[PDB]
Every structure is written in structure tokens, then in C-alpha cells.
């Protein structure tokens, strides 16, 4: 889709497989912020968003936290935090036609910079001058959108680039999206390194009498230390106790 109206696909309740990101040859930029690109298969995310669009090549630098430009200001803005990855690849062969490919549009004019992850699909006439527009196109009244006009013989700079932005949400809360990781069996009365659906720690997993309400997934005691957890496969409440330590 055009950058001004970018496609957003929500991803949840799946076994995340990022093999496509590593096996593909087309990708030109594979930037990641807040996560490491190679470690994406060892993480559990609460929810994922895949925002896909087509941009000009020279503007691919604008898809990043804390950047400025026409695309960042008026088309697609990334938040300053942005734990996630931007993947962009040249698509000159697929998104360019002899003559001109004018399907793809961007937003030239807007009253103010759009907030992070905000989409503006309105096509109202922009009032650049003092005179009100009243829906007509005139001297200072302009159509907000503008065609990229992609042609095969263009500088790598002005060639189309397809961009996909993945927005991970990383938190101790129960994560729906996870890597395969081949879950294993669990033992009770041994100090173990446990990975419970993203929760990770070192301790013994005793059987627990905690009464968990169905929506509850783990327990935190005073001072907010995780002391109980329910395993996804069995749905039983286990107390996490740190294995004994002490000065000698």
C-alpha cells in the first residue's frame, strides 16, 4: 500500500518463525532497535504489528526512531522508544513500469506532524494560504497527496523500496507470540533455570497452594518479585523459591 495509508497486520497467538528474515536475499536494510536481530527466535512477545508500505529509497532513512522529513512528519512516524525492527528491500523490478507507476502516493501537506503510529487517510484540500478552501482546488488550496511516479530508469535513490516494520511488545505479562524453542519437561524439587513463557529465573519449582483465578498467569509477592507461575501446557500453579545461597 501507499505510505500515507500503510497496511497494519496484527500478529498474535502464533509460533513466531523468523526464518524468512534470515533466508531472504532481497533485504537491503535490516535495522533493529531495542532487540538483537539474531535473537528474535529466543524471545516471547505480547503482540506484534507488521506495518507494510512502499516508500522512495532515499526516504528509507526516515523510517527510524527520532527522525524528521516528509514521510516521518506526515506519512509514517515511529515512536522514540520503538522496540522493533525495520526491514526494507528494493522493489524496482516489481513496483516500476514503463511510463510511470503513479498508484503509490505520499502526503505532501498536513497541518501538524502526526503522532507515532497514527494514520491519516483523509484527502481534504489543504489550506496553505489565508483564504479558506471550502473543498475547492486553487492557488493556495492543494490536494494533500502526491504521486511518487516510479519509472524503471531512476536513480537507486528514487527507486521504490518495500518496507515492513515489526513492532514488538516485550513485557513480563503473558506473551502470546513465542519462538518454537522445543519446550521440555519440568522437575519440581531442583534448582533449575526455568523459562516459563518468557519468564526466566533460577530456582526450585515447588507445588503451590496459591489460588489463581483463571485469568491470572503468575504471582508477585511484596517488593514485586515473581514467586508463582502457571505453566502453559499443564495450567498448574508452581511456587518459585530461590535455591539456597549464603556467605561461607
Amino acid at each position, epitope marked *: 500500500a501507499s505510505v500515507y495509508a500503510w497496511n497494519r497486520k496484527r500478529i498474535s497467538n502464533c509460533v513466531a518463525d523468523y526464518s524468512v528474515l*534470515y*533466508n*531472504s*536475499a*532481497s533485504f537491503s536494510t535490516f535495522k533493529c532497535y531495542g532487540v538483537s536481530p539474531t535473537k528474535l527466535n529466543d524471545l516471547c512477545f505480547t503482540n506484534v504489528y507488521a506495518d507494510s508500505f512502499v516508500i522512495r529509497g532515499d526516504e528509507v532513512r526516515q523510517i527510524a526512531p527520532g527522525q524528521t522529513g516528509k514521510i516521518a512528519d506526515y506519512n509514517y512516524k515511529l515512536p522514540d522508544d520503538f522496540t522493533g525492527c525495520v526491514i526494507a*528491500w528494493n522493489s524496482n*523490478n*516489481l513496483d516500476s513500469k514503463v511510463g510511470g507507476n503513479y498508484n503509490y502516493l505520499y502526503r505532501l501537506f498536513r497541518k501538524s506532524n502526526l503522532k507515532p503510529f497514527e494514520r491519516d487517510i483523509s484527502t481534504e484540500i489543504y489550506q496553505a494560504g489565508s483564504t479558506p478552501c471550502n473543498g475547492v482546488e486553487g492557488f493556495n488550496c492543494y490536494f494533500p497527496l502526491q504521486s511518487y511516479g516510479f519509472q524503471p530508469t531512476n536513480g537507486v535513490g528514487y527507486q521504490p523500496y518495500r518496507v515492513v516494520v515489526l513492532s514488538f511488545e516485550l513485557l513480563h505479562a503473558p506473551a502470546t507470540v513465542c519462538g518454537p524453542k522445543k519446550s521440555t519437561n519440568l522437575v519440581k524439587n531442583k534448582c533449575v533455570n526455568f523459562n516459563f513463557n518468557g519468564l526466566t529465573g533460577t530456582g526450585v519449582l515447588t507445588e503451590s497452594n496459591k489460588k489463581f483465578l483463571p485469568f491470572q498467569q503468575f504471582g508477585r509477592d511484596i517488593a514485586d518479585t515473581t514467586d508463582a507461575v502457571r505453566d502453559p501446557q499443564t495450567l498448574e500453579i508452581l511456587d518459585i523459591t530461590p535455591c539456597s545461597f549464603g556467605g561461607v
Partner: antibody
Amino acid sequence: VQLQQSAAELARPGASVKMSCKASGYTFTSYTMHWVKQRPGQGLEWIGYINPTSGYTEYNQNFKDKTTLTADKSSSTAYMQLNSLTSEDSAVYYCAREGHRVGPAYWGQGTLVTVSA
Amino acid sequence: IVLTQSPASLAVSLGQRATISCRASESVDNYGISFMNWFQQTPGQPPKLLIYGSSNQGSGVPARFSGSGSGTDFSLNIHPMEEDDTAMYFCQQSKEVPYTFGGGTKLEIKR
């Protein structure tokens, strides 16, 4: 890298054809051997490959029943056996050596099998 | 994998660009590299490896031949067309076990 083949074998329908590919210029024990079929003035169809060191042969689904691949490392030669010939089988067969991550990389001339009574 | 080869009959005069295109049903890229190969066959001769991989050039291949593209779309370009380029050009995939070739393009010099 040179591959040498038989020359223009003719057989009646229902018979079997035994096809040879002598290999020279390399070890022949480190590269798998592929076979490709080409009907006259038509496209190329991959038949199957054989590993010379261990006789693990993998064939195309179309050619699985009527084709058998074997290899002799002592004389550094490969063989394809075509069984139950039909008029469709009349074509040029090529023996190729693996290379550059291509299956049929280095081709050896080409031998024409003509099926007719 | 099914490879469809656009123009399969191309007539270009000497010294002019010649483009033969291959499109794949599924992705051909794997392990980071691409596995689309271009073969050339002069009449009465075995096919010869022209472009192994997406862009790497085969042994004894002039700089005229160039391979480009990725994913499912690849192109073979011959800008300095010569007399010797009259041949049948195939596109082949090496990603999956059944190796499949393109439709084939008979390249002719225009007059």
C-alpha cells in the same frame, strides 16, 4: 572437467536403454551426477541425480518408475537405465556434474535416444 | 517450483539490450543467497552455465551477460548483443530438490 557419452541409440518401444557417462578432469567421488532430458526443440526436464560415493539416488516424480541411476567409481562412470520405452522418451539426454550450487552445472555433450519400432 | 519465462522469443538488433525474465511460483532465496541460474545453449551444443546464483558469472562468460533480481523475480540482460548470442536461454532453480527449468528463450538478431 569433461563428460563423454554414448552416441545416438535407437530402440523399439518396450525395450530398455543403458546409457553411460564417462567422467574426467576431476575426482568423480566429490560431485554428484545429474541427468537431464530434452525433447527436440523443447524445454529441459531434470531426471535425477546419484551420489557417486554412496549410491543415494533421487529421481524426479515423473521419471521415478521408468528410470534407474547407477555409478561405477572404479572406472569413473555413471549410467542411466530407461525401461518400458515409449515414443515420448525419444529425446536428448545430458549427464551433468554438480557445481556452483547448481544441480546440473557442467554438462557433457548429449546423447540422443530414439524410440521407434 | 514453476518458472515462467517472459519473453521466450526475443528479437533485438546487435548492440541493443536484450532482457529475458524469470518468475517463480515460490521464493527461490535460501540461506541468504539466491538459487536462480541462467543457462545458455547454442544449437547442437550442450547447455552451458551462464550465470550461477542471482548475479555471479560462470566460467568464461563475457561481461555482456548479467543476472539480477531476487525473491521470485529475476532478469538476464545482454546489453552489447553480438552474433554469438543467438542461442536458447533457460532459467533454472536450485532451491528445491526437483530442479526445474524455464520455458526457454530463443534469442534472435533483429533486422
